[PDB]
DNA sequence: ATTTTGTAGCTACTTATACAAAATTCAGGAAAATTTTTCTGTATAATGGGAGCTGTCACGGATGCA
């Protein structure tokens, strides 16, 4: 649980978004993530993605 | 034949009363003491702020219009 909580990275935050003010297709696997962001990986709750 | 029962009895004898001032304390007052809260001034000169945020909607309006 650590590691994965260090090398976690996040989109939100001051500078980021909010959950609301950003919806969906901004949560998806832009095909550039490949190799760079485990797509398998996400809370959910709203925070998916 | 004493003993317990008596009866005819009191006196002692002791609650009972009620008052009662005396205590005897208590409360409140009053300060008065003082601690804490307020009030006021200040002289070179001084003259427009902060922020950012930037990804729905809807609708009805949208007057505004060209």
């Amino acid at each position: 649980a650590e590691l994965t909580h260090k090398r976690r990275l996040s989109a939100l935050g001051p500078g980021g978004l909010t959950r609301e003010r950003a919806g969906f297709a901004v949560r998806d696997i832009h095909p550039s993530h490949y190799g760079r962001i485990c797509p398998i990986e996400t809370p959910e709750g709203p925070n998916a993605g």
mmCIF file of all heavy atoms in Angstrom, chain B residues 40-54:
data_model
loop_
_atom_site.group_PDB
_atom_site.id
_atom_site.type_symbol
_atom_site.label_atom_id
_atom_site.label_comp_id
_atom_site.label_asym_id
_atom_site.label_seq_id
_atom_site.Cartn_x
_atom_site.Cartn_y
_atom_site.Cartn_z
ATOM 1 P P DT B 40 -12.293 58.795 24.022
ATOM 2 O OP1 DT B 40 -12.413 60.238 23.898
ATOM 3 O OP2 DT B 40 -12.601 57.950 22.879
ATOM 4 O "O5'" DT B 40 -10.810 58.836 24.468
ATOM 5 C "C5'" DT B 40 -10.531 59.809 25.292
ATOM 6 C "C4'" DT B 40 -9.418 60.582 24.823
ATOM 7 O "O4'" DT B 40 -8.297 59.742 24.768
ATOM 8 C "C3'" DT B 40 -9.511 61.108 23.460
ATOM 9 O "O3'" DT B 40 -8.429 61.950 23.422
ATOM 10 C "C2'" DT B 40 -9.190 59.849 22.689
ATOM 11 C "C1'" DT B 40 -7.982 59.483 23.443
ATOM 12 N N1 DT B 40 -7.693 58.319 23.514
ATOM 13 C C2 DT B 40 -6.544 58.145 24.006
ATOM 14 O O2 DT B 40 -5.763 59.007 24.093
ATOM 15 N N3 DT B 40 -6.239 56.988 24.272
ATOM 16 C C4 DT B 40 -7.016 55.960 24.175
ATOM 17 O O4 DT B 40 -6.647 54.899 24.446
ATOM 18 C C5 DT B 40 -8.280 56.200 23.724
ATOM 19 C C7 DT B 40 -9.181 55.101 23.539
ATOM 20 C C6 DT B 40 -8.596 57.385 23.474
ATOM 21 P P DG B 41 -8.293 63.160 22.414
ATOM 22 O OP1 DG B 41 -7.947 64.395 23.053
ATOM 23 O OP2 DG B 41 -9.486 63.103 21.601
ATOM 24 O "O5'" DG B 41 -6.942 62.805 21.741
ATOM 25 C "C5'" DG B 41 -6.164 62.022 22.408
ATOM 26 C "C4'" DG B 41 -4.839 62.558 22.407
ATOM 27 O "O4'" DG B 41 -3.960 61.477 22.494
ATOM 28 C "C3'" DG B 41 -4.488 63.122 21.125
ATOM 29 O "O3'" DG B 41 -3.219 63.625 21.235
ATOM 30 C "C2'" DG B 41 -4.511 61.852 20.336
ATOM 31 C "C1'" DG B 41 -3.819 60.947 21.263
ATOM 32 N N9 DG B 41 -4.400 59.765 21.357
ATOM 33 C C8 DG B 41 -5.622 59.479 21.150
ATOM 34 N N7 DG B 41 -5.867 58.312 21.384
ATOM 35 C C5 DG B 41 -4.739 57.870 21.841
ATOM 36 C C6 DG B 41 -4.434 56.705 22.240
ATOM 37 O O6 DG B 41 -5.104 55.764 22.300
ATOM 38 N N1 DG B 41 -3.234 56.645 22.604
ATOM 39 C C2 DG B 41 -2.432 57.624 22.706
ATOM 40 N N2 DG B 41 -1.265 57.307 23.106
ATOM 41 N N3 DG B 41 -2.641 58.713 22.184
ATOM 42 C C4 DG B 41 -3.860 58.774 21.864
ATOM 43 P P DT B 42 -2.470 64.215 19.976
ATOM 44 O OP1 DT B 42 -1.196 64.723 20.361
ATOM 45 O OP2 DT B 42 -3.368 65.044 19.213
ATOM 46 O "O5'" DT B 42 -1.926 62.952 19.310
ATOM 47 C "C5'" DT B 42 -1.099 62.259 20.039
ATOM 48 C "C4'" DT B 42 0.225 62.302 19.458
ATOM 49 O "O4'" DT B 42 0.580 60.992 19.260
ATOM 50 C "C3'" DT B 42 0.236 62.866 18.099
ATOM 51 O "O3'" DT B 42 1.485 62.838 17.652
ATOM 52 C "C2'" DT B 42 -0.524 61.802 17.406
ATOM 53 C "C1'" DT B 42 -0.076 60.595 18.167
ATOM 54 N N1 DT B 42 -1.035 59.844 18.553
ATOM 55 C C2 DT B 42 -0.746 58.816 19.246
ATOM 56 O O2 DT B 42 0.345 58.484 19.533
ATOM 57 N N3 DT B 42 -1.766 58.129 19.526
ATOM 58 C C4 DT B 42 -3.007 58.412 19.187
ATOM 59 O O4 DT B 42 -3.914 57.794 19.485
ATOM 60 C C5 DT B 42 -3.201 59.399 18.467
ATOM 61 C C7 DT B 42 -4.526 59.629 18.079
ATOM 62 C C6 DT B 42 -2.266 60.126 18.200
ATOM 63 P P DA B 43 2.497 63.945 18.082
ATOM 64 O OP1 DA B 43 3.656 63.257 18.593
ATOM 65 O OP2 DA B 43 1.860 65.097 18.628
ATOM 66 O "O5'" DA B 43 3.001 64.426 16.759
ATOM 67 C "C5'" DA B 43 3.595 63.579 16.039
ATOM 68 C "C4'" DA B 43 3.561 64.056 14.668
ATOM 69 O "O4'" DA B 43 2.329 64.685 14.507
ATOM 70 C "C3'" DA B 43 4.609 65.059 14.346
ATOM 71 O "O3'" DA B 43 4.931 64.904 13.109
ATOM 72 C "C2'" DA B 43 3.899 66.340 14.527
ATOM 73 C "C1'" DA B 43 2.474 65.945 14.178
ATOM 74 N N9 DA B 43 1.593 66.538 15.022
ATOM 75 C C8 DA B 43 1.602 66.354 16.270
ATOM 76 N N7 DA B 43 0.680 66.982 16.862
ATOM 77 C C5 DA B 43 0.015 67.586 15.856
ATOM 78 C C6 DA B 43 -1.097 68.452 15.799
ATOM 79 N N6 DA B 43 -1.740 68.805 16.809
ATOM 80 N N1 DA B 43 -1.547 68.925 14.669
ATOM 81 C C2 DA B 43 -0.966 68.536 13.679
ATOM 82 N N3 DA B 43 0.009 67.638 13.622
ATOM 83 C C4 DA B 43 0.415 67.151 14.754
ATOM 84 P P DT B 44 6.414 65.186 12.718
ATOM 85 O OP1 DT B 44 6.832 64.123 11.787
ATOM 86 O OP2 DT B 44 7.093 65.415 13.980
ATOM 87 O "O5'" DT B 44 6.302 66.578 12.070
ATOM 88 C "C5'" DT B 44 5.727 66.667 10.897
ATOM 89 C "C4'" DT B 44 6.762 66.559 9.871
ATOM 90 O "O4'" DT B 44 7.516 65.426 10.071
ATOM 91 C "C3'" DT B 44 6.257 66.319 8.580
ATOM 92 O "O3'" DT B 44 5.809 67.421 8.172
ATOM 93 C "C2'" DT B 44 7.513 66.005 7.917
ATOM 94 C "C1'" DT B 44 8.200 65.217 8.949
ATOM 95 N N1 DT B 44 8.220 63.922 8.808
ATOM 96 C C2 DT B 44 7.971 63.308 7.650
ATOM 97 O O2 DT B 44 7.627 63.823 6.662
ATOM 98 N N3 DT B 44 8.094 62.017 7.692
ATOM 99 C C4 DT B 44 8.459 61.300 8.743
ATOM 100 O O4 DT B 44 8.563 60.111 8.698
ATOM 101 C C5 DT B 44 8.731 62.016 9.896
ATOM 102 C C7 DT B 44 9.169 61.327 11.107
ATOM 103 C C6 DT B 44 8.611 63.267 9.860
ATOM 104 P P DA B 45 5.153 67.464 6.751
ATOM 105 O OP1 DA B 45 6.193 68.032 6.004
ATOM 106 O OP2 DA B 45 3.835 68.020 6.766
ATOM 107 O "O5'" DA B 45 5.192 66.004 6.179
ATOM 108 C "C5'" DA B 45 6.058 65.819 5.177
ATOM 109 C "C4'" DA B 45 5.705 64.731 4.278
ATOM 110 O "O4'" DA B 45 6.024 63.485 4.855
ATOM 111 C "C3'" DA B 45 4.298 64.623 3.944
ATOM 112 O "O3'" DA B 45 4.312 63.874 2.843
ATOM 113 C "C2'" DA B 45 3.827 63.828 5.104
ATOM 114 C "C1'" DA B 45 4.859 62.806 5.062
ATOM 115 N N9 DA B 45 5.080 62.177 6.216
ATOM 116 C C8 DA B 45 5.162 62.693 7.412
ATOM 117 N N7 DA B 45 5.554 61.851 8.270
ATOM 118 C C5 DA B 45 5.737 60.768 7.529
ATOM 119 C C6 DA B 45 6.154 59.564 7.828
ATOM 120 N N6 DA B 45 6.422 59.208 9.035
ATOM 121 N N1 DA B 45 6.268 58.693 6.861
ATOM 122 C C2 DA B 45 6.000 59.066 5.649
ATOM 123 N N3 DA B 45 5.596 60.207 5.266
ATOM 124 C C4 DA B 45 5.511 61.004 6.272
ATOM 125 P P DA B 46 3.044 63.791 1.909
ATOM 126 O OP1 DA B 46 3.307 63.779 0.489
ATOM 127 O OP2 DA B 46 2.169 64.854 2.278
ATOM 128 O "O5'" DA B 46 2.574 62.361 2.257
ATOM 129 C "C5'" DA B 46 3.541 61.439 2.426
ATOM 130 C "C4'" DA B 46 3.188 60.226 1.728
ATOM 131 O "O4'" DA B 46 3.293 59.220 2.666
ATOM 132 C "C3'" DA B 46 1.770 60.188 1.389
ATOM 133 O "O3'" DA B 46 1.534 59.067 0.794
ATOM 134 C "C2'" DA B 46 1.199 60.164 2.741
ATOM 135 C "C1'" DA B 46 2.134 59.233 3.393
ATOM 136 N N9 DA B 46 2.435 59.641 4.665
ATOM 137 C C8 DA B 46 2.242 60.823 5.198
ATOM 138 N N7 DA B 46 2.580 60.862 6.428
ATOM 139 C C5 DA B 46 2.965 59.617 6.670
ATOM 140 C C6 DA B 46 3.397 59.041 7.752
ATOM 141 N N6 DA B 46 3.563 59.680 8.846
ATOM 142 N N1 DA B 46 3.751 57.798 7.682
ATOM 143 C C2 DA B 46 3.608 57.160 6.554
ATOM 144 N N3 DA B 46 3.190 57.622 5.445
ATOM 145 C C4 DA B 46 2.879 58.870 5.591
ATOM 146 P P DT B 47 1.128 59.130 -0.721
ATOM 147 O OP1 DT B 47 1.727 57.983 -1.381
ATOM 148 O OP2 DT B 47 1.275 60.497 -1.147
ATOM 149 O "O5'" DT B 47 -0.375 58.853 -0.734
ATOM 150 C "C5'" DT B 47 -0.800 57.782 -1.417
ATOM 151 C "C4'" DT B 47 -2.234 57.903 -1.532
ATOM 152 O "O4'" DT B 47 -2.524 58.981 -0.727
ATOM 153 C "C3'" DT B 47 -2.666 58.329 -2.885
ATOM 154 O "O3'" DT B 47 -3.777 57.775 -3.218
ATOM 155 C "C2'" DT B 47 -2.838 59.762 -2.725
ATOM 156 C "C1'" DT B 47 -3.359 59.750 -1.408
ATOM 157 N N1 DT B 47 -3.282 60.847 -0.905
ATOM 158 C C2 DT B 47 -4.316 61.529 -0.914
ATOM 159 O O2 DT B 47 -5.259 61.118 -1.343
ATOM 160 N N3 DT B 47 -4.269 62.680 -0.352
ATOM 161 C C4 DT B 47 -3.236 63.199 0.202
ATOM 162 O O4 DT B 47 -3.249 64.251 0.697
ATOM 163 C C5 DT B 47 -2.096 62.437 0.152
ATOM 164 C C7 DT B 47 -0.841 62.963 0.748
ATOM 165 C C6 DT B 47 -2.168 61.270 -0.411
ATOM 166 P P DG B 48 -3.640 56.825 -4.445
ATOM 167 O OP1 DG B 48 -2.574 55.996 -3.962
ATOM 168 O OP2 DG B 48 -3.577 57.476 -5.721
ATOM 169 O "O5'" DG B 48 -4.799 55.845 -4.461
ATOM 170 C "C5'" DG B 48 -4.507 54.744 -5.097
ATOM 171 C "C4'" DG B 48 -5.143 53.636 -4.468
ATOM 172 O "O4'" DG B 48 -6.478 53.898 -4.574
ATOM 173 C "C3'" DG B 48 -4.939 52.408 -5.214
ATOM 174 O "O3'" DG B 48 -5.264 51.427 -4.490
ATOM 175 C "C2'" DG B 48 -5.883 52.581 -6.359
ATOM 176 C "C1'" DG B 48 -6.944 53.421 -5.762
ATOM 177 N N9 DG B 48 -7.328 54.544 -6.484
ATOM 178 C C8 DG B 48 -7.042 55.776 -6.199
ATOM 179 N N7 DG B 48 -7.583 56.606 -6.977
ATOM 180 C C5 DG B 48 -8.316 55.863 -7.773
ATOM 181 C C6 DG B 48 -9.131 56.228 -8.796
ATOM 182 O O6 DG B 48 -9.382 57.305 -9.207
ATOM 183 N N1 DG B 48 -9.689 55.201 -9.355
ATOM 184 C C2 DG B 48 -9.479 53.958 -8.981
ATOM 185 N N2 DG B 48 -10.114 53.061 -9.670
ATOM 186 N N3 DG B 48 -8.698 53.587 -8.029
ATOM 187 C C4 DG B 48 -8.172 54.595 -7.470
ATOM 188 P P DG B 49 -4.440 50.105 -4.687
ATOM 189 O OP1 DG B 49 -3.066 50.514 -4.527
ATOM 190 O OP2 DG B 49 -4.967 49.426 -5.857
ATOM 191 O "O5'" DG B 49 -4.849 49.205 -3.506
ATOM 192 C "C5'" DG B 49 -6.065 48.739 -3.473
ATOM 193 C "C4'" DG B 49 -6.005 47.457 -2.843
ATOM 194 O "O4'" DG B 49 -7.155 46.791 -3.214
ATOM 195 C "C3'" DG B 49 -4.973 46.617 -3.432
ATOM 196 O "O3'" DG B 49 -5.105 45.445 -2.879
ATOM 197 C "C2'" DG B 49 -5.539 46.571 -4.796
ATOM 198 C "C1'" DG B 49 -6.918 46.182 -4.406
ATOM 199 N N9 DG B 49 -7.881 46.666 -5.239
ATOM 200 C C8 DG B 49 -7.864 47.759 -5.965
ATOM 201 N N7 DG B 49 -8.937 47.921 -6.602
ATOM 202 C C5 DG B 49 -9.679 46.921 -6.170
ATOM 203 C C6 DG B 49 -10.880 46.552 -6.539
ATOM 204 O O6 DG B 49 -11.617 47.095 -7.281
ATOM 205 N N1 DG B 49 -11.249 45.451 -5.940
ATOM 206 C C2 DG B 49 -10.504 44.780 -5.108
ATOM 207 N N2 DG B 49 -11.023 43.701 -4.620
ATOM 208 N N3 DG B 49 -9.342 45.082 -4.806
ATOM 209 C C4 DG B 49 -9.018 46.166 -5.350
ATOM 210 P P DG B 50 -4.118 44.280 -3.236
ATOM 211 O OP1 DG B 50 -2.873 44.514 -2.522
ATOM 212 O OP2 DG B 50 -4.183 44.009 -4.645
ATOM 213 O "O5'" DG B 50 -4.897 43.064 -2.730
ATOM 214 C "C5'" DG B 50 -6.127 42.911 -3.173
ATOM 215 C "C4'" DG B 50 -6.375 41.478 -3.262
ATOM 216 O "O4'" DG B 50 -7.316 41.212 -4.277
ATOM 217 C "C3'" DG B 50 -5.180 40.767 -3.710
ATOM 218 O "O3'" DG B 50 -5.369 39.460 -3.482
ATOM 219 C "C2'" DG B 50 -5.201 41.109 -5.178
ATOM 220 C "C1'" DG B 50 -6.666 41.221 -5.464
ATOM 221 N N9 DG B 50 -6.942 42.419 -6.053
ATOM 222 C C8 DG B 50 -6.126 43.425 -6.190
ATOM 223 N N7 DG B 50 -6.638 44.398 -6.778
ATOM 224 C C5 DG B 50 -7.874 44.013 -6.965
ATOM 225 C C6 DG B 50 -8.817 44.619 -7.647
ATOM 226 O O6 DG B 50 -8.784 45.708 -8.092
ATOM 227 N N1 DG B 50 -9.920 43.902 -7.717
ATOM 228 C C2 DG B 50 -10.054 42.706 -7.185
ATOM 229 N N2 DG B 50 -11.205 42.131 -7.381
ATOM 230 N N3 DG B 50 -9.102 42.052 -6.628
ATOM 231 C C4 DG B 50 -8.064 42.792 -6.530
ATOM 232 P P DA B 51 -4.832 38.381 -4.508
ATOM 233 O OP1 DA B 51 -5.009 37.131 -3.801
ATOM 234 O OP2 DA B 51 -3.508 38.748 -5.019
ATOM 235 O "O5'" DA B 51 -5.935 38.382 -5.640
ATOM 236 C "C5'" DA B 51 -7.189 37.956 -5.327
ATOM 237 C "C4'" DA B 51 -7.515 36.838 -6.208
ATOM 238 O "O4'" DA B 51 -8.265 37.355 -7.270
ATOM 239 C "C3'" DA B 51 -6.299 36.204 -6.823
ATOM 240 O "O3'" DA B 51 -6.427 34.865 -6.868
ATOM 241 C "C2'" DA B 51 -6.200 36.772 -8.196
ATOM 242 C "C1'" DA B 51 -7.444 37.589 -8.338
ATOM 243 N N9 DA B 51 -7.104 38.929 -8.383
ATOM 244 C C8 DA B 51 -5.899 39.416 -8.176
ATOM 245 N N7 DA B 51 -5.823 40.668 -8.360
ATOM 246 C C5 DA B 51 -7.067 41.003 -8.741
ATOM 247 C C6 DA B 51 -7.604 42.197 -9.110
ATOM 248 N N6 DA B 51 -6.909 43.313 -9.104
ATOM 249 N N1 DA B 51 -8.886 42.228 -9.422
ATOM 250 C C2 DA B 51 -9.540 41.084 -9.442
ATOM 251 N N3 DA B 51 -9.115 39.893 -9.106
ATOM 252 C C4 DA B 51 -7.870 39.945 -8.729
ATOM 253 P P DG B 52 -7.671 34.159 -7.566
ATOM 254 O OP1 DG B 52 -8.932 34.466 -6.882
ATOM 255 O OP2 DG B 52 -7.301 32.751 -7.686
ATOM 256 O "O5'" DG B 52 -7.661 34.694 -9.039
ATOM 257 C "C5'" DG B 52 -8.777 34.596 -9.748
ATOM 258 C "C4'" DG B 52 -8.594 33.582 -10.818
ATOM 259 O "O4'" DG B 52 -8.452 34.239 -12.041
ATOM 260 C "C3'" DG B 52 -7.402 32.685 -10.680
ATOM 261 O "O3'" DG B 52 -7.785 31.423 -10.996
ATOM 262 C "C2'" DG B 52 -6.401 33.195 -11.682
ATOM 263 C "C1'" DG B 52 -7.131 34.269 -12.408
ATOM 264 N N9 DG B 52 -6.592 35.530 -12.103
ATOM 265 C C8 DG B 52 -5.294 35.819 -12.147
ATOM 266 N N7 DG B 52 -5.029 37.041 -11.847
ATOM 267 C C5 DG B 52 -6.246 37.597 -11.575
ATOM 268 C C6 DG B 52 -6.564 38.895 -11.199
ATOM 269 O O6 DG B 52 -5.825 39.838 -11.006
ATOM 270 N N1 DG B 52 -7.877 39.052 -11.044
ATOM 271 C C2 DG B 52 -8.783 38.093 -11.176
ATOM 272 N N2 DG B 52 -10.014 38.462 -10.926
ATOM 273 N N3 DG B 52 -8.529 36.863 -11.549
ATOM 274 C C4 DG B 52 -7.229 36.682 -11.725
ATOM 275 P P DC B 53 -8.199 30.434 -9.828
ATOM 276 O OP1 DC B 53 -9.003 31.184 -8.854
ATOM 277 O OP2 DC B 53 -6.993 29.718 -9.402
ATOM 278 O "O5'" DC B 53 -9.201 29.468 -10.536
ATOM 279 C "C5'" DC B 53 -10.538 29.817 -10.564
ATOM 280 C "C4'" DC B 53 -10.988 29.886 -11.978
ATOM 281 O "O4'" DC B 53 -11.510 31.191 -12.223
ATOM 282 C "C3'" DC B 53 -9.852 29.677 -12.975
ATOM 283 O "O3'" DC B 53 -10.319 29.009 -14.075
ATOM 284 C "C2'" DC B 53 -9.504 31.080 -13.335
ATOM 285 C "C1'" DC B 53 -10.864 31.705 -13.328
ATOM 286 N N1 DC B 53 -10.739 33.117 -13.259
ATOM 287 C C2 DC B 53 -11.195 33.877 -12.187
ATOM 288 O O2 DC B 53 -11.714 33.344 -11.228
ATOM 289 N N3 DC B 53 -10.973 35.186 -12.203
ATOM 290 C C4 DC B 53 -10.383 35.722 -13.241
ATOM 291 N N4 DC B 53 -10.195 37.018 -13.251
ATOM 292 C C5 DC B 53 -9.935 34.969 -14.315
ATOM 293 C C6 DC B 53 -10.127 33.688 -14.283
ATOM 294 P P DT B 54 -9.848 27.528 -14.443
ATOM 295 O OP1 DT B 54 -9.260 26.879 -13.291
ATOM 296 O OP2 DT B 54 -9.127 27.509 -15.686
ATOM 297 O "O5'" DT B 54 -11.177 26.856 -14.884
ATOM 298 C "C5'" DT B 54 -12.272 27.658 -15.028
ATOM 299 C "C4'" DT B 54 -12.155 28.475 -16.285
ATOM 300 O "O4'" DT B 54 -11.311 29.596 -16.051
ATOM 301 C "C3'" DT B 54 -11.508 27.752 -17.424
ATOM 302 O "O3'" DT B 54 -12.487 27.062 -18.101
ATOM 303 C "C2'" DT B 54 -10.934 28.895 -18.257
ATOM 304 C "C1'" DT B 54 -10.857 30.063 -17.270
ATOM 305 N N1 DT B 54 -9.527 30.586 -17.086
ATOM 306 C C2 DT B 54 -9.174 31.703 -17.706
ATOM 307 O O2 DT B 54 -9.893 32.293 -18.446
ATOM 308 N N3 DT B 54 -7.932 32.102 -17.467
ATOM 309 C C4 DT B 54 -7.043 31.510 -16.661
ATOM 310 O O4 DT B 54 -5.925 31.903 -16.528
ATOM 311 C C5 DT B 54 -7.484 30.363 -16.048
ATOM 312 C C7 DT B 54 -6.584 29.634 -15.143
ATOM 313 C C6 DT B 54 -8.699 29.976 -16.268
#
